[PDB]
Structures are given as C-alpha cells and as structure tokens.
Design a protein around this ligand. Structure first.
Ligand SMILES: Cc1cc2nc3c(=O)[nH]c(=O)nc-3n(C[C@H](O)[C@H](O)[C@H](O)COP(=O)(O)OP(=O)(O)OC[C@H]3O[C@@H](n4cnc5c(N)ncnc54)[C@H](O)[C@@H]3O)c2cc1C
Ligand SMILES: [Cl-]
Ligand SMILES: [Cl-]
Ligand SMILES: [N+]
Lengths: 666, 133
C-alpha cells in the first residue's frame, strides 16, 4: 500500500471509510453527501502522509494547507478541523520531533501520571504539547518500566520488551525514525535439539509443526462449530480444548486399529467356513471314489444297472471334484486378501513419546508468546487480536530497547524513586500520596486536576492492594481487573567471552523431557553485537523458576548448551542476569492475556475513566478525574510496546478534550 | 465448517471424552481391551484354519478320474436308452447330468428323448418317482 492509501494503512485506518471516532468528531460529514466524505478522507489521508513522510518535524496546520492542492486547499476550516483532530488524537505530531511552534509559556491544567513506562511517557509528551502541566511519578530508579535493558561494558540485552513485530502499521515505525533505533531482522530458522543434545531431523520438525497448527485449527472448530465453550459451569481454556482434540485423535487411531483387525477376523472367519466345506467335500469325494472303485470290481459283461452304477458314480465324482476346484479357487483369493491386510496395518500411535516432546516445544513456544500456560487462556478469545497484526519482518533492537523510553523522557518532569501509595479523586480535583522508595517515611502530596494511572495490571491485582484508591474503584472496574489474565515469562542473559554457537542462526530450541517442564529454557537467542545468548523461561516454568537461585538456573543453561555444542566448547559466562517479573513489585508479571472467563470487552472496561460523585448533595455531575492507560487497556494491541504507546496517546487526547476543550468537534 | 483433513471430532465423541475427569482414560482403555480381545480371536481362528488346511494336505489328487472323451452320436442304442431311463430315475430333469452319464448324447438329444420316448419308457411315472425322494 502506497501514496495516500499507504498513509491510512500505516496509521491503522481504513482509507476509503470514516471510523467511529471520526464520526463522533465529524457528525456533519459522516451524515452528509458521499462526495464530502471523500473530501474529508483525502484531507485526512494526505495530512497523515505529510507527517509520515517526515516524522522528525512538527506538522503544522499552515504547513499542511500549503502542501495541499486545489480544490482541497480551498476549505480551510475543514482542513484545520482535520488537522486538529489528528493532532489531538496523536495520529500526527507524536513522539519526539523538532517543535516549530513553541510551547505555550503559561500552562493550563495539572495532570499527575503514575508510572513512566511507554504508556505514561507517550501520554506526557502529548499533554505537554497540548499545553498542560505534567508530572510523572515513577517508583523505580529509571524510566521505561517493562522496557528494561541490561547494559554492562559492551553487553546489551533486553530483560523486557525485545521484539518489534513488523513495521507495517506499527507506530514504532515512526518512533524508530525519531530515535536512534538500530533495528535488525530476526532470521526465522530455528533448529531444535532434543534433551540428549542431538538435532531434530527436518522431516520430524515439519511434520510436528504441521500437526501443531492442525491442532490449533482443531480447537477453533471445537469452539465455533461444536460450541464447546463451557464445561461444568467453567469457561473452557485453550489447554483443555487441545487435550480433548489430542485425546480424540488417540481415540481415532484405536478406532482404525479395531476396524482393521475386525476385517481380518471377518475374512479369517469366511476362510473357516470355506475350509469346513472343503473338508466335508473331501470326505464325500473320498467316499465316492471308494464306491466307484467297488462298482468297477463288477467286471463285464455286466447288466445295465451295474454299468449304470459305474457311469453314475463317475459323474457324481467329477461334479464334486469340480465343486472342490471352485472352492480351492476361493481359498487362494481369501488367503491373499489376508496377506494384504496383514501387510497394510493402520497407524500404531497418534504421537510417539519423541513426537509429543517436540510438540510440547511448540506449546511452550505458544506459552511464551502469550506469557501464560495454555490452561489459562480463553478458548473463545485467546487470539481475539490476531486480525490486527502488523506486516513485515519481526525485528529486535540491536542497541537495546531502553533507547526509546530514555528518549521519550527528554524534557519531562519525572520523579524517580517515588512510589504512589494512594490516589484520592474528588469533584474538585485529585491528590496523590507517594513515598520515597529509599526511606518510606518520607511522604509527598501531589494535587492535580486529573490522574492518569498506568500501573500494570499485575499491580492493580495486588491483594491486599499496593495502591489504594479513595473512593474505592467501582465493581465494574475491579471485576474487570480480577477477570483479566496477567502472565509471566523470564529471560536468562548469558554473557560469554567467545562465540561457540552458530553465528548465522538467530535462535535455537531445547526440547524438554516432560510436558511439565516444556517451558524451561526451551529457547535460546543469539542477538547482539557482543557474544550473548538469551535463554527463555515460559509457561508453568516461569513461576517456578523464580524460586530458584541464579546459579542453579545458569547451571541448567550451561548443561543444555554443553549437551548441544560439546562439553569443552562452552566456557563459564563472564556475566549473567536472570529476570523475575512476577516478584518485581512494580510489575508483578510480564503482560496481560485473555484469560478463560474474560474477553476483549474487559480491555475496554480497563480503559474507562472514573468520575467521582459530587461533594455536595444535589450538585451537578462532575468531570472525569481518574484515567487509565497501559498495555492492559487497549483491546486491539494488548501486551505490547506499541499498545502501551497507543494507550497513552489515547488518554492524552481524552484528557485534553476534557480539560482544554475541543474546537474541531463543532 | 469442517475439521482439518484427517482430524476427527464429533459432538458425540467430545461429550464422551469430557463427561468426567477420567472419561478419556476410560474410553481409551476400553478400546485397548477390545483390541486385545480381537487379536486373541484372530490367533484362535488362525490356529483352527491351520488344522483344517492340514487335513486337506494332498488335495483331491488321488481321487481324480481320467476323462471319458467320446464323440457325440445320433442313434440311440438299447444300452443308451436303459442308461437314460435310470439316469432320469436318479437325476430327474438335470439334463446335463443325464447327458454326462450316457456320455455320447448331448443335452438337446436328451431333452428330445424325453418327448420321443415319453409313453414307451413311462417317463411320467419315472419323473413322479424322482419327486418322491
Ligand atoms: C519480559 C517481557 C517481554 C516482552 N516482550 C515484548 C516484545 O517483545 N515486544 C513488545 O512490543 N512488547 C513486549 N512486552 C510487553 C511490553 O513490555 C509492555 O506491554 C509495555 O512495555 C508496558 O508498557 P506500560 O507503560 O503499560 O507498563 P509499564 O512499562 O510497566 O509502566 C508502568 C510503570 O509504573 C511504575 N509503577 C509501578 N507501580 C508504581 C507505583 N506504586 N508508583 C509509581 N510507579 C509505579 C512501574 O515501575 C512502571 O515504570 C514484553 C514485556 C515483558 C515484561
Ligand atoms: Cl526483573
Ligand atoms: Cl526487573
Ligand atoms: N520452528
């Protein structure tokens, strides 16, 4: 997709149609003649094109109007409306760019942002741009949150976000032109090595992967066609569905074995009946011959009855011998029909032990992608966001993903080592209570017009709470929080002084011995300038490994590698880092997932701002005061960096609309 | 609309495997048992067939008789008539058998004989006598 249509696609918009959001701001247009709608769409797509063509500088209304041609550049109000609309919603002029129009010297409104991860940072830049007073309170001694990079000497390794999942339609594409991001393609070749250390032949690998995909396809059929979505009042999980599908395939293998052996008995039985006939017929023949022989003893000349006896017995004997030859013909047919079936047995098993282990590697891989065991994913909605995937190859940030948040932090007022303890929101404003993480007694009070909460879902779930809301959040919100899933996945960074692995291979797998341990160090990444190997811990293993010391974890890693590349080839690592996202009090997990019993609607609920009740009985309905952003608040792109970034852009626009007013909606 | 090719999933089977916590194990074991039950049934019949084959050892070779190859003749000799009459008594309307027994008279010639000698050889009485057995 290129030209103005490419711009829409790159902004996640339909090029030939107005969105629901656009309808809300341009009700006059969407309800009017088709021609006007087409004019609007062109202005919108073109404005997006100008921004995308050069995201390093602020795209102003004046600049836009000048670059438009007749007759589009004639309706100046419509152009200005579209421009302000895009700007306000963060579709243009987001991230880090050179500002043309200086920031208003005197600011309007005060906003406190809890958390300085990508969602918080993106919202802050926007709010600052719109002219608001913004302060971010961050518990950690750094910015970035779940975007955390290990840096020591020349060693660089991401402990959090690491992959950019395609640039087609990804807002990170704009960010990568603004920030010194060194993107490198991830080669998809990934050999797997069984526990014994020997590689998996191409044939197996492909067959098992095809089956893995077939089984996923099968659970989808089980969900949409057999409506197997509730079992014993409980929502069915992906794991359960897969177990059922596999059991059914095992059943089919046995059903076929049975029908095969039943064809053998049926034939084997027909043979018995034929043989019985033959044995009885041979007796009759044996007897007739004896009679014929006796009749032939009456030598001629003999009366006609004696002659008749000889001739008669002869005929009866021949007739019976003909019957025997016919049955012998049938015997040869049945006998061979048996050597045929005996030689063509159906399959012995659905999946051998080896096949199951390799299959478990694929499941571990899926558990890693969703940062959760398959038994916790909603069968109905686990892949609710698949239709929104970006295009292009997956990439990694060669210089460490932290370069993004660090850059987004430029010029912002950030209070590090400040842990928010309480959020108070009332009809006339909010107050946030925070402590200094280095000496908890030291307390801070921040008064503001609005609060943007970007605390991770893991933190929001903490019981008893880590952050108290006063008044408490309503049940519609807390229930969404309880329902949503909050996963976990960990990484083990191994820094070596030499390269003992295949340098042309970006990643390789380790196939576990049992299903229980499938996610334990199942995948290794070779990705940076330095000789570094990154090991992954997924699924059920993630949670358990957190209770294991680094040395024992690293020991296991080395053991695996020695088994693959040879004992003498693998040296002791010079530096090792092990992440523990679940234990991290500021994260309490890695990222959200659609839990069984949940749905994409919960992400919408997480996103709805809270409006306090009036302070005075009978006083009019207040303004919303408490807003939410973060990866767990964006239905179409949850659990990602771009999702977090987009959530911040969204809330910044909503806050600004609420407190600064909208001049583009009229 | 359909499962992947080769994948089997019926409403009926899903219900069976998910009826309880160990429903699957039960289904699969009951099938493992049906399998053993059918296999021993095979060995059994195989053993029986092996014995029956051992009884047919030699086939029917020592009991075969050379063929009496003789051209078909037009005239009926007294010998032939008498053979026919007895043949009719034993076989009835099985003209093929009657022809075979006489040896030198085709099927049609035999059918004709039935009409031509009907009164003289009391063929009606003979046929009704074959019917009594
Ligand atoms: C191991 C891992 C791998 C991942 N892989 C990828 C990937 O490959 N690609 C991708 O796009 N995404 C990936 N994700 C997801 C991505 O990291 C997140 O979706 C995104 O960075 C989170 O953004 P956020 O701003 O919503 O949350 P955060 O970055 O978590 O921001 C919340 C902030 O609030 C702070 N905070 C918490 N409690 C308090 C408090 N009491 N007071 C003040 N501040 C507080 C936290 O310290 C944090 O800075 C991964 C995540 C992890 C953990
Ligand atoms: Cl960590
Ligand atoms: Cl951490
Ligand atoms: N693979």
């Amino acid at each position: 997709p290129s030209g103005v249509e490419g711009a829409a696609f790159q902004s996640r918009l339909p090029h030939d149609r107005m969105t629901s959001q656009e309808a809300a701001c341009f009700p006059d247009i969407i309800s009017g003649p088709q021609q006007t709608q087409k004019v609007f769409l062109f202005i919108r797509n073109r404005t997006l094109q100008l921004w995308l063509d050069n995201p390093k500088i602020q795209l102003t209304f004046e600049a836009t109007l000048q670059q438009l041609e007749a007759p589009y550049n004639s309706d100046t109000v419509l152009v200005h409306r579209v421009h302000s609309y895009l700007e306000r919603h963060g579709l243009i002029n987001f991230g880090i760019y050179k500002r043309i129009k200086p920031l208003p010297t005197k600011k309007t409104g005060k906003v406190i942002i809890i958390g300085s991860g990508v969602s918080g940072l993106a919202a802050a830049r926007q709010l600052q741009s719109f002219g608001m007073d913004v302060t971010l309170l961050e518990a950690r001694d750094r910015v970035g949150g779940r975007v955390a990079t290990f840096r020591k000497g020349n060693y660089v390794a991401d402990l959090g976000a690491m992959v950019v999942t395609g640039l087609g339609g990804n807002p990170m594409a704009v960010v990568s032109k603004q920030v010194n991001m060194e993107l490198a393609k991830i080669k998809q070749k990934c050999p797997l090595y069984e526990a014994n250390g020997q590689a998996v032949p191409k044939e197996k690998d492909e067959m098992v992967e095809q089956e893995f995909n077939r089984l996923l396809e099968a659970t989808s059929y089980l969900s949409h066609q057999l409506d197997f979505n509730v079992l014993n009042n409980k929502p069915v999980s992906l794991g359960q569905a897969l177990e059922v599908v596999i059991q059914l395939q095992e059943k089919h293998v046995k059903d076929e074995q049975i029908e095969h052996w039943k064809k053998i008995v049926k034939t084997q039985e027909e043979l018995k009946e034929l043989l019985n006939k033959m044995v009885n017929l041979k007796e009759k023949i044996k007897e007739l011959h004896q009679q014929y022989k006796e009749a032939s003893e009456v030598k001629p000349p003999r009366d006609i009855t004696a002659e008749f006896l000889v001739k008669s017995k002869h005929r009866d004997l021949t007739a019976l011998c003909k019957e025997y030859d016919e049955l012998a013909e049938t015997q040869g047919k049945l006998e061979e029909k048996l050597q045929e079936l005996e030689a063509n047995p159906p399959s012995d098993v659905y999946l051998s032990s080896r096949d199951r282990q390799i299959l478990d590697w694929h499941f571990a891989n899926l558990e890693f992608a969703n940062a959760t065991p398959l038994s916790t994913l909603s069968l109905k909605h686990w892949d609710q966001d698949d239709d929104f995937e970006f295009t292009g190859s997956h990439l990694t940030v060669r210089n460490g993903y932290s370069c993004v948040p660090v850059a987004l932090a430029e010029g912002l007022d950030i209070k590090l080592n400040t842990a928010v303890r309480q959020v108070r929101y009332t009809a006339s404003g909010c107050e946030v209570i925070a402590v200094n993480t280095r000496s908890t007694s030291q307390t801070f009070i921040y008064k503001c017009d609005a609060v943007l909460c970007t605390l991770p879902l893991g933190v929001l779930k903490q019981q008893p709470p880590a952050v108290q809301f006063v008044p408490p959040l309503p049940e519609w919100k807390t229930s969404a929080v309880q329902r949503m899933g909050f996963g976990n996945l960990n990484k083990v960074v191994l820094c070596f002084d030499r390269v003992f692995w295949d340098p042309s291979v970006n990643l390789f797998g380790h196939v576990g011995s049992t299903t229980a341990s499938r996610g334990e160090l199942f995948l290794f990444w070779n990705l940076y300038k330095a000789p570094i190997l990154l090991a992954l811990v997924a699924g059920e293993a993630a949670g358990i490994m957190e209770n294991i010391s680094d040395d024992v974890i690293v020991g296991r890693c080395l053991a695996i590698l020695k088994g693959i590349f040879g004992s003498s080839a693998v040296p002791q690592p010079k530096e090792t880092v092990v992440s523990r996202w679940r234990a991290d009090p500021w994260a309490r997990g890695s990222y959200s997932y659609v839990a069984a019993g949940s749905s994409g609607n919960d992400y919408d609920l997480m996103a709805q701002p809270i409006t306090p009740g009036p302070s005075i009985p009978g006083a009019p309905q207040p303004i919303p005061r408490l807003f939410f952003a973060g990866e767990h608040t964006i239905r179409n792109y949850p659990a990602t960096v771009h999702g977090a970034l987009l959530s911040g852009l969204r809330e910044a626009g909503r806050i600004a609309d609420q407190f600064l007013g909208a001049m583009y909606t009229l | 609309r359909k499962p992947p090719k080769g994948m089997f999933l019926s409403q009926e089977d899903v219900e069976a495997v998910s009826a309880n916590a160990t429903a699957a194990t039960t289904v699969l074991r009951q099938l493992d048992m049906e399998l053993v039950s059918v296999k021993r049934q095979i060995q059994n019949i195989k053993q029986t067939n092996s014995a029956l084959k051992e009884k047919l050892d030699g086939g029917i070779e020592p009991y075969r008789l050379p063929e009496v190859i003789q051209k078909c003749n037009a005239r009926w000799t007294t010998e032939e008539q008498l053979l026919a009459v007895q043949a009719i008594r034993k076989y009835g309307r099985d003209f093929q058998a009657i022809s075979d027994v006489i040896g030198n008279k085709s099927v049609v010639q035999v059918k004709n004989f039935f009409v031509n000698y009907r009164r003289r050889f009391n063929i009606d009485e003979v046929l009704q006598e074959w019917e009594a057995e």
